[PDB]
């Protein structure tokens, strides 16, 4: 943001060009920060809970070793490999080709999947499981079907109904001056990306981890 | 449970429901209606028959393409019964002839048939075995029929402890035994409380008990909503049959003169959850064959 404000000042404003941007790896982090979640696991490192929902926790985010004895891990998802032995209640969520979802790319465009194949097994959708869990528990969620879900989606954040369309943000000056309160020491250790080669591109997901074609080309590249 | 035992979609006619039912007997009345409701559910019905293939031919086009299956059995060999319940989700016991033969009696049909099949279904390793028995089956006398069914209830409670003993009253239907037996006559006048219950409510109760657990182990009883007198029942069925008129064994006449009583120590239809229907609608349904051409609903409803 210092580089961004530096080019913002020490130049003539030719237009609404944007120096600065970041990129992500997984789309649901963009969606979860649009809907207003806490990023990172520091709020769990501060307050160890008695009940936690792992909606697709892939790697070593938390374990039973980082938590009190009464865990009650409710895992929800498809072909879990890390955490699925560790968890307490396993719920078979659907997949990305198997439900009408709403996904956000790294630039805020909203793109939705289509139900091409119904999920095999019992294998309900995710919000359907959650609202049925709300009904069976002593409460309710004030909506029934998917159009009402998308109406509450607009009543949480409005860009998630204008499908396949983009609109960029602003306020680089306000973001930069809000960055000017907390000083951290910059550690001079050699920063390196983990995605360094072909094997680490191929293995570092759950769907690519479960397959065999990825394993064949992993052993073909490494050999 | 393996896959292809999970359900899929809607009900019936190549809509895979999740039960595989081995249904003993099933050639007569109640078994045919129960195979009708299971083919409407869209299941796999293994019916064994010992008779001619013409009667299972008449009950054949009920299920869908290859859903129901036919196999032979006997009342002597455990090997054919174990072959019948090799792999089955559920098994129901519906058997018993209302008159004796020269090869099989009232003795040991209800003792030797359910013990053998319950033994081989426990050893084959199935769950949810549903056995029908008649109401008021007691060790107390006046029917070889009823004392044998009481011994049968005690034996199927002793072996295979997680069984569903279920008992209907004198069920009536389109091809009934006792109401058709009343219409086919010529008679006396006495007093006896008796409550018929219609057959489709009973088999809806059976399919709800067969796919709705938390009802395993507990014995159930079917009580019709009427509970009235026999004399006005006979006069009502003659009045709806448009005839004034003011195998018949002694065991059958003592069954229709046995006072059917009910005890609420075992739950009925509402704790299982299906609506019961009164007599008169289905009575006007079944009482055809009046005369050449030929309402006055009595509705005694005693006590």
């Amino acid at each position: 943001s210092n580089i961004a404000q530096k080019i913002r000042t020490s130049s003539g404003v030719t237009g609404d060009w944007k120096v600065m941007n970041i990129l992500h790896r997984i789309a649901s982090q963009v969606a979860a920060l649009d809907l207003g979640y806490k990023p990172g696991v520091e709020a769990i490192r501060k307050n160890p809970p008695k009940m936690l929902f792992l909606l697709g926790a892939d790697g070593g985010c938390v374990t039973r070793q980082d938590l009190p004895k009464d865990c009650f891990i409710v895992y929800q998802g498809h072909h879990g490999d890390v955490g699925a032995p560790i968890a307490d209640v396993i719920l078979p969520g659907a997949a990305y080709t198997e439900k009408s979802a709403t996904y956000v790319n790294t630039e805020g465009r909203a793109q939705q999947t289509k139900v091409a194949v119904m999920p095999p097994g019992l294998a309900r959708e995710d919000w359907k499981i959650i609202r049925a869990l709300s009904e069976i528990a002593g409460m309710t969620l004030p909506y029934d079907t998917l159009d009402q879900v998308r109406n509450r989606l607009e009543e949480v954040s409005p860009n998630l109904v204008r499908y396949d369309d983009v609109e960029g943000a602003n306020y680089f000056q306000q973001a930069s001056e809000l960055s000017k309160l907390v000083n951290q020491q910059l550690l001079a250790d050699p920063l390196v990306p983990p995605q360094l080669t072909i094997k680490d591109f191929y293995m570092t997901d759950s769907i690519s981890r479960a397959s065999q074609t990825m394993a064949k080309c992993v052993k073909a590249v490494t050999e | 449970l393996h896959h292809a035992v999970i359900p899929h979609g809607k009900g019936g006619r190549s809509s895979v429901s999740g039960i595989v039912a081995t249904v003993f007997g099933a050639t007569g009345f109640l078994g045919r209606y129960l195979v009708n409701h299971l083919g409407r559910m869209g299941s796999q019905v293994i019916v064994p028959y010992r008779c001619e293939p013409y009667d299972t031919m008449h009950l054949r086009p009920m299920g869908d393409l290859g859903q129901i299956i036919f196999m032979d059995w006997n009342g002597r060999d455990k090997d054919s019964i174990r072959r019948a319940v090799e792999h089955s989700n559920v098994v129901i016991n519906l058997v018993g002839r209302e008159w004796e033969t020269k090869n099989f009696d009232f003795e040991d049909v209800f003792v030797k048939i359910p013990q053998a099949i319950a033994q081989v279904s426990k050893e084959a390793g199935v769950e949810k075995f549903i056995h029908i028995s008649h109401l008021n089956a007691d060790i107390k006398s006046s029917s070889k029929y009823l004392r044998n069914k009481a011994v049968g209830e005690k034996e199927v409670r002793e072996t295979f402890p997680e069984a569903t003993i279920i008992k209907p009253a004198d069920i009536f239907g389109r091809e009934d035994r006792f109401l058709n037996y009343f219409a086919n006559i010529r008679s006396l006048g006495k007093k006896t409380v008796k409550q018929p219950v219609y057959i489709v409510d009973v088999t809806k109760g059976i399919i709800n008990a067969i796919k709705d657990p938390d009802a395993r182990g507990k014995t159930f009883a079917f009580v019709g909503p009427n509970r009235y007198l026999l004399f006005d029942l006979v006069q009502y069925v003659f009045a709806v049959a448009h005839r004034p008129f003011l195998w018949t064994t002694r065991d059958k006449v003592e069954r229709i003169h046995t006072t059917d009583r009910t005890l609420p120590h075992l739950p009925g239809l509402e704790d299982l959850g299906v609506q019961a229907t009164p007599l008169e609608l289905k009575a006007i349904e079944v009482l055809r064959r009046h005369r050449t051409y030929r309402s006055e609903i009595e509705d005694v409803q005693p006590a």
Binding site: - | K10, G12, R13, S14, S15, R32, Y33, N36, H37, R40, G42, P61, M62, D64, L65, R174, V200
Partner: protein, 208 residues
């Protein structure tokens, strides 16, 4: 071009061109398109206010007899406002000619019901009412021909699916034939056969 190519004639083409021009001259009120195809059959495309005047003119007038009526259909075309196209297919006896009077209509319009001037159009009109859904006013009898009585939905539309909504089976509960929602045993695999690469350049519509 001589072997295995159908030889067209120009005498019938010129005569049908002249006759279509003549028909549209003498009936200016109801005529919109007069087309002759490559194989010389006449088509006259018609507003639905003149079915009785055009057919009373064409059955008579002594210079075009056209006694006989053939196919009547109203081909169920989406994408338009007026969907259906009613095709009276008139055959002469003294002349050896074939004309197609194609009038247009939408879903909720009575056309003038040609049963009074062609007695052959009685069951044709009743069949088009039952199958498509186009009501015909001032007409003696409209019933359901070629469909079941308890069946409805006007099935020859493009909106009605291939398999119907009801399906009959016998059952022993009520001892009769009952109707249930359809549960097919096989998918009816629809094939994506319409390949690209524009097999006819002469029929290219102009783009936007």
């Amino acid at each position: 071009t001589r072997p295995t190519v159908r030889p067209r004639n120009d005498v019938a083409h010129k005569q049908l061109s002249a006759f279509g021009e003549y028909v549209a001259e003498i009936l200016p009120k109801y005529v919109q398109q007069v087309q002759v195809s490559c194989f010389s059959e006449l088509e006259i495309c018609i507003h639905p206010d003149g079915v009785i005047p055009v057919l009373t003119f064409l059955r008579d007038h002594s210079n075009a007899q056209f006694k006989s009526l053939a196919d009547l259909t109203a081909v169920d075309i989406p994408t338009r406002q007026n969907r259906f196209e009613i095709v009276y297919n008139l055959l002469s006896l003294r002349f050896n000619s074939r004309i197609r009077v194609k009038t247009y209509t939408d879903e909720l319009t009575p056309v003038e019901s040609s049963v009074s001037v062609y007695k052959a159009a009685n069951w044709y009109e009743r069949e088009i009412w039952d199958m498509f859904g186009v009501f015909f006013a001032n007409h003696p009898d409209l019933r359901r021909i070629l469909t079941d009585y308890g069946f409805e939905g006007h099935p020859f539309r493009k909106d009605f699916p291939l398999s119907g909504y009801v399906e009959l089976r016998y059952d022993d509960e009520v001892k009769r034939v009952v109707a249930e929602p359809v549960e097919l045993a096989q998918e009816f695999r629809k094939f994506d056969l319409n390949s690209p690469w524009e097999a006819f350049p002469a029929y290219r519509q102009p783009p936007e």
